[PDB]
Amino acid sequence: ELKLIHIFTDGSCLGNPGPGGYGIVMKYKGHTKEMSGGFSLTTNNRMELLAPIVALEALKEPCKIILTSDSQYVRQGIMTWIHGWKKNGWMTSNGTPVKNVDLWKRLDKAAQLHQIDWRWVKGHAENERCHQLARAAAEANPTQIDTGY
Amino acid sequence: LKLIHIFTDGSCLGNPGPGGYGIVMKYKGHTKEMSGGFSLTTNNRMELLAPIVALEALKEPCKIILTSDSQYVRQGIMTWIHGWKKNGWMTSNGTPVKNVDLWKRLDKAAQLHQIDWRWVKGAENERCHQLARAAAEANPTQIDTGY
Amino acid sequence: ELKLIHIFTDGSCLGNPGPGGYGIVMKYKGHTKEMSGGFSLTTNNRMELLAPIVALEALKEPCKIILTSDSQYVRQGIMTWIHGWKKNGWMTSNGTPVKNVDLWKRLDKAAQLHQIDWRWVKGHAGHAENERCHQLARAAAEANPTQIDTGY
Amino acid sequence: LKLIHIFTDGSCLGNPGPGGYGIVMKYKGHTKEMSGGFSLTTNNRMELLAPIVALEALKEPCKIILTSDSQYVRQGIMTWIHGWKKNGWMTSNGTPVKNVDLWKRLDKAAQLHQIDWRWVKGHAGHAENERCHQLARAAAEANPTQIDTGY
After folding, report:
1. Cα–Cα distance for residue pair C11/C8, rounded to 1 Å
2. What's B23's DSSP letter?
3. Domains of chain D, earliest start first
C-alpha cells in the first residue's frame, strides 16, 4: 500500500506574461500542508503546470495520488499532448521543441513514480485555498526567476 | 552537498487559538514557500513546527543555514534538548516534557542534517510571517494532534 | 409535500463484457450517501442502466429528483427507446425480445413513481459526484464479485 | 420474516478525522453495498452509524443476522442501552450520553426488526466483512465534505 495523498493545485499570473505564482494543498489522512511560490516573470500556463510538478517532486517515496487541478492546459497535456509529444521526441508539428518542455518533462518524469488519479475541476475548497496561495505569492513582489521561461 | 537558507515563522491568533507557520527556502536562485494552518494551537507549537516541517521536507543530507526569531526554539536547541534526551524525554519523575511530540521530531530531523542556526530579532522572515498569518486566517480546520 | 433529492450514477465493467459495477451518490440537503454493487460478468451498458434503477428503487416515498448521468445508452432510452419499445409490448418487430428488457422494464416502472429531471453529462470529469460514482463502481467491479447479473 | 444478512464496519484515519461506514446486505442471490463519508468524525460514531443506515434502509420488518466487529456497538446493545433508557438517556452521573443521537436511532431501528447480532474479532474473514472494511476505508479516503452533525 502506497500512502494515499490528495493534491490540489493552482497557478495564477493575471497579466500574462507578468509576475505570478502557484499554490498547493496536500492532504494525508488528517494532515494538511501548503506550499507556494512566486516569480517576477512567468505565464499562467507555466504556473498551472509548475504547481502539480512541485507537489509531486516533494514526495519521499511512491504514493497513490488523487490530484485535482483546474487547468485546461494541464488537462490536455495529460490526456492528449504528452503521449503525442513523447512519441515525437518533444517536438511539435514544426520540429520546434515544445513550448514549456522543461516543465512537461518534469511532470512526465514525476508522474511515473506514482499511481495518479487525475481529477479535473471547473470550487472544491482546497482549490480555492490554492488560488489564495498562488495570488499571495504572485503579489509579494517576487524577484525569483522563472529560468525555463 | 547543497547549501540551503531556511527561514521560519509561526503565528497564533490568541494563544491558545487558530494558528499557522510560514517557511521560506532559498537555494542558489530558487525560492520556495511552505505554510500550514491549525484550528486550535499555540504560539510556541507553531514557532517550533516551522523548522520541523522545513527540515523533514528535505530529501537528502545538506548544509542548512536556519534563521528564526523564536526564543522558544533557540533555548530548545541551545540548552534544553540535550538534557531532555539524556532523561529519556521526560521531567525527572515521569511527566513527559511539554510539546515533546515536537521536540522529538525536531531532534530527530536536525540529526539528519548539518545546521548553522541564526537567531535574529525580528526580509525573507517577513515573508514567513506573511505565510504564517495567512495560513492562520484561512479558517483552518486541521487539528494539531499535540493540543 | 415532496423531498428534493440529487442522484448521480455511474457504471463500469473491467474489459466489456467482464466483472462490473455501479456507483451511486444521493444528496438530500446536507446529507450524502453512497451505494454500489458488483457483478461477476456483465457489460458497461447494463451497469450504467442499473445504477439509476437501484437508486430510485431504494426510495421509500415519491420524490423530486435531479438525476445526473453520463450514460448515452440510458439517455437514449429515457427519451426515445423505452417509448418505442412499449408501443410494441417490449418486443422487436420480429418478436425477438428487447435487449436488456429486464433493466428497461425496471427503470420505466420506477420512473413513474417519482417526478424526475434528468441531466446528461459528457463524462465524469469534472463533476465531483460522478467522479465518486465512477470510483465506487470500479472498486465494486475490482472486488471479484460473485453475485450474478441475472442475465444478461 | 423476510430474512437478511448484513455486515457493517466503520473507519477513521486518525481519530477524530475523515470517516466512513461500509455495509454489505445479502438476500438470496442479491448483494448490495452502501457507504458514506464525513469530514470529521470518530471511529465509534462510524461503527455505530453503519448498522443504523443499514436498518433504516430496510422497507419492512425483517429477520436480520447482523455481523459486526464493534465492541462499541456490542456493549451498547448488550448493556448500555438498557441502562440509559431507564435513566432518561443520561450517563451514571447524569449528563447527556456521548453519541445519543446515534444510540437513539439504533434503538428505534432495532425495535422494528428481529435481529440476531453476531460479533467477530476483525474483518478477516468472511469476505463480506472484508468488503465492508474496504467500503468504509474508501469512503473515508475520498475527501468527504459532508458534516457529521453528530460529532
Report:
1. 11
2. E
3. 1-151 (3.30.420.10)
- Residue D71's CB is within 10 A of a number of other CB atoms, namely 13
Experimental method: X-ray
* Rg, chain A, Cα only: 15
Best mutation target among A120, A124, A126 (most C Cβ atoms within 10 Å) is A120
CA distances from C54 to A64, C9, C58 (A): 31, 10, 6
CA torsion through residues C103, C108, C109, C111, sign: positive
C-alpha cell of C7?
442522484
Resolution of the experimental model, in Å, one decimal: 2.5
Q: Which three cell numbers stand for residue D82?
A: 438498557
With an 8 Å Cβ cutoff, is C126 touching chain A? yes
A135 to chain C, minimum CA–CA distance in Å?
24
CB A114: neighbour CB atoms within 10 A? 18
Residue D138, phi then psi, degrees to nearest 5: -70, -35
- Taking the C-alpha atoms of residue D105 and residue B144, their distance in angstroms, rounded to an integer, is 32
> Dihedral angle at the C-alpha atoms of A107, A109, A112, A118, nearest 10 degrees?
0
Which among C126, C131, C135 has the least Cβ separation from residue A122?
Answer: C126
Question: Any idea what the Cα angle at residue A12 is, between residues A9 and A13, rounded to 5°?
Answer: 155
User: Best of D12, D133, D143, D146 to disrupt the A interface by mutation (most A CBs within 10 Å)?
Assistant: D143
Count C/D contacts: CB-CB distance under 8 Å: 50
Cell numbers standing for residue C75: 439517455
